[PDB]
Design an enzyme around this catalytic site. Structure first.
Site, short mmCIF file in Angstrom:
data_model
loop_
_atom_site.label_atom_id
_atom_site.label_comp_id
_atom_site.label_asym_id
_atom_site.label_seq_id
_atom_site.Cartn_x
_atom_site.Cartn_y
_atom_site.Cartn_z
N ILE A 235 -36.94 -22.81 -23.01
CA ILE A 235 -35.50 -22.67 -23.29
C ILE A 235 -34.99 -23.73 -24.26
CG2 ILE A 235 -34.58 -24.11 -21.43
CD1 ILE A 235 -33.20 -20.79 -22.81
N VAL A 238 -35.62 -21.92 -27.49
CA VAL A 238 -34.82 -20.70 -27.53
C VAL A 238 -33.34 -21.02 -27.73
CG1 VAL A 238 -34.04 -18.75 -26.12
CG2 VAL A 238 -36.49 -19.25 -26.32
N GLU A 239 -32.85 -22.10 -27.11
CA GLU A 239 -31.47 -22.53 -27.36
C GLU A 239 -31.22 -22.74 -28.85
OE1 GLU A 239 -30.52 -25.78 -28.52
OE2 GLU A 239 -28.34 -25.54 -28.32
N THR A 240 -32.13 -23.44 -29.52
CA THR A 240 -31.97 -23.67 -30.95
C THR A 240 -32.07 -22.36 -31.73
OG1 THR A 240 -32.87 -25.86 -30.70
CG2 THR A 240 -32.87 -24.94 -32.94
#
Lengths: 287, 287
Positions: A235, A238-240
């Site tokens: 994550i 994935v956040e970026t």
């Protein structure tokens, strides 16, 4: 520019290390521990890597004097003009910035390197690491999050992120809502009432945002996470991907944007600092 | 004064509601929602309940003007002399305090009541609630923790605390180390190597600190948590018991200390404010 799917855009960020090129630059530099900790403190204040490089070579109370010059921003930077801030720390200015430096001088005296060491500790949970960051004056939750990512990706100390720590932030939350609305590869989310969440970013609830996050993690876990490919993507990456993809589909992130703008901002510093010259050489490049 | 065991000291805090008397005072007052939210914001800035009461009756931009008087602390408080701070917010002073108010004015304009509403949200995890608090200028992890407790205990919105969220703080960590060293009712903790943790506060590791916390929770769970006895005592109340007990065995917390010092500080405000008079009447008393 052509707007790409998040799958194709994410694969480009990951393969070129445009995802977070600074982390690969720092790993390549192999700075000594104390200088690396000073670099990181400077970077967490001003969010400019060439500027951080220049500042990292000053030691002890002298480091804090030079950082204080940048805080006050009345004296000329060594590159001419004002001491720049990355947009993420634009608010590190005026009396707020000088009070921030004063807090640091009173806490760490002639050992500025202890700050990043204290924040990093031995890693830990996201809650523990961001709490230690946020003890410091003018270090809020947004820089707290970034430092936690860097404690893992740069200093090699694992920090456990989960979906709640990411989607309490407005930007990755909104990116995930857009993704449910517009990405046909994400299946319908069945809510707690057997109702299906509708394809409308304004009606997406936290439950569906986590559904989106789980889908994207499952999608990207066949990629090893940058800077060096030590574990599957999680994550944190994935956040970026989500936040940069949201900018991408809004017209504000052409491919290679991060790499290009860092190198542009960092090049003036390479003339005035040996570490900044190493940082410029260590940055990943376009293609 | 006689130094009591943590079991007897905790039972006194819980039965007299000396544990956190402000929470019972506020529950008794039954303030209207907007005024309660203004009271809480004022209290989270200055940590003085009679002062918070006075400030809570101002509305809109006027609330922020009066709070700004307290921040600057040049004009006389209505009780004469300076605008006091509880020791927990002694650092809310000077340009830091006025910058804190300016942040609030820019964010909430004429709706100061929205601040506590935003922080409280619907409750949630400790991480989510303290993140929302700590968005605000000069609201760090210590006040973040306190607000999370009050969102549960005062506003009735559950916030999930766990042992890591409490023992990342130095004071309850040290209290738990002393407790393992000095409390014979806590059994030997067997570490991950079949070794037993020695009875020495300076050698106690996080693992044993959690062992102490679990023991105390198990001990105190036959008490219903104040202010109103709605659920069994949990780590939120044990944290307070641990920190006040540490002060107690150091000579700095005679029985009823919190109740006595609040009433002493709050009484001058009752003359100048109807809400402060209600707050004084609502405070629990000695015996």
């Amino acid at each position: 520019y052509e707007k790409l799917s998040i799958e194709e855009f994410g694969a480009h960020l990951l393969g070129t290390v445009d995802l977070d090129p600074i982390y690969l630059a720092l790993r390549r530099m192999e700075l000594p521990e104390a200088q690396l900790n000073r670099w990181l403190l400077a970077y967490w204040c001003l969010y400019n890597g060439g500027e951080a490089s220049y500042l990292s070579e000053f030691e002890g109370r002298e480091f804090f004097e030079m950082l204080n010059h940048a805080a006050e921003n009345v004296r000329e930077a060594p590159i001419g003009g004002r001491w720049p801030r990355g947009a993420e720390r634009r608010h590190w200015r005026g009396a707020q910035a000088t009070s921030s430096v004063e807090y640091l001088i009173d806490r760490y005296d002639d050992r500025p390197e202890d700050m990043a060491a204290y924040c990093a500790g031995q890693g830990g949970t996201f809650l523990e690491v961001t709490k230690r960051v946020q003890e410091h004056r003018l270090f809020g939750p947004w820089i707290g999050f970034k430092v936690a990512d860097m404690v893992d990706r740069v200093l090699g100390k694992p920090v456990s992120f989960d979906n709640a720590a990411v989607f309490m932030f407005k930007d990755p939350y909104k990116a995930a809502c857009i993704q449910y609305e517009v990405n046909p590869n994400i299946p319908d989310h069945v809510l707690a009432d057997g109702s299906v969440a509708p394809r409308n970013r304004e009606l997406v609830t936290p439950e569906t945002v986590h559904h989106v996050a789980q889908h994207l993690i499952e999608h990207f876990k066949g990629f090893q996470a940058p800077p060096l490919g030590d574990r599957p993507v999680n994550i944190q990456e994935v956040e970026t991907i989500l936040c940069k993809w949201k900018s991408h589909q809004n017209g504000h992130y052409p491919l290679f944007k991060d790499i290009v703008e860092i190198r542009e901002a960092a090049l003036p510093w390479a003339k005035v600092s040996k570490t900044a010259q190493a940082f410029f050489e260590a940055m990943p490049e376009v293609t």
